[PDB]
Ligand SMILES: N=C(N)NCc1ccccc1CCCCCCCCCC(=O)N[C@H](CCCCN)C(=O)NO
Ligand SMILES: [Ca+2]
Ligand SMILES: [Ca+2]
């Protein structure tokens with residue numbers, strides 16, 4: 001596993017998040033459910049707790065966009081970049097952005113929101129890319145219809161080395 005320079009991390013176990021907008025590719029419940037599961041794979045092996053906010057500024061603001069969406073990291077249409085998140089910190093820290101130019105789904109079609117978001121939140125939590133082809137933090141996409149997706153060994157060690165067990 002790999003940590004960001006200066007070992008960026010949150011200084012609190014209770015984080016909040018908010019879904020700013022949704023993709024038309026799937027139902028709103030699906031989207032909501034995908035993100036909830038994405039966070040759980042991380043909170044399941046650490047003391048980290050996540051709670052969704054209906055309004056206001058949360059630690060982790062989630063959103064979909066195309067091309068230029070407001071930051072200095074614009075998307076590139078279909079394929080290529082799928083999403084990008086900011087490491088822990090104030091403002092953009094922890095924020096996760098999804099390319100709505102891709103087709104998001106909750107199945108083996110297009111790009112699985114749940115899997116990609118689980119990877120993204122790993123960045124929002126303080127994990128950089130892993131060089132282990134068997135880790136969730138590996139920089140290449142792959143689908144998994146596996147029931148009850150568990151966090152790979154490498155990712156577990158990397159997240160616990162930051163917030164301890166849980
Ligand atoms: N062996 C495998 N496939 N394990 C993973 C893995 C294991 C188990 C289940 C799913 C996956 C796939 C998770 C998503 C993989 C994301 C791959 C990157 C796609 C391109 C992209 O969006 N890159 C930006 C780069 C920009 C960073 C600069 N600020 C990125 O960093 N996204 O996160
Ligand atoms: Ca793209
Ligand atoms: Ca933030």
Ligand SMILES: [Ca+2]
Nearest residue numbers: 100101102103
């Ligand atoms: Ca889309």
Ligand SMILES: [Zn+2]
Nearest residue numbers: 019028029032
């Ligand atoms: Zn709703």
Ligand SMILES: [Zn+2]
Nearest residue numbers: 019053054055
């Ligand atoms: Zn509402």
Ligand SMILES: [Zn+2]
Nearest residue numbers: 069071073097
């Ligand atoms: Zn962005």
Ligand SMILES: [Zn+2]
Nearest residue numbers: 119123129139
């Ligand atoms: Zn990544």
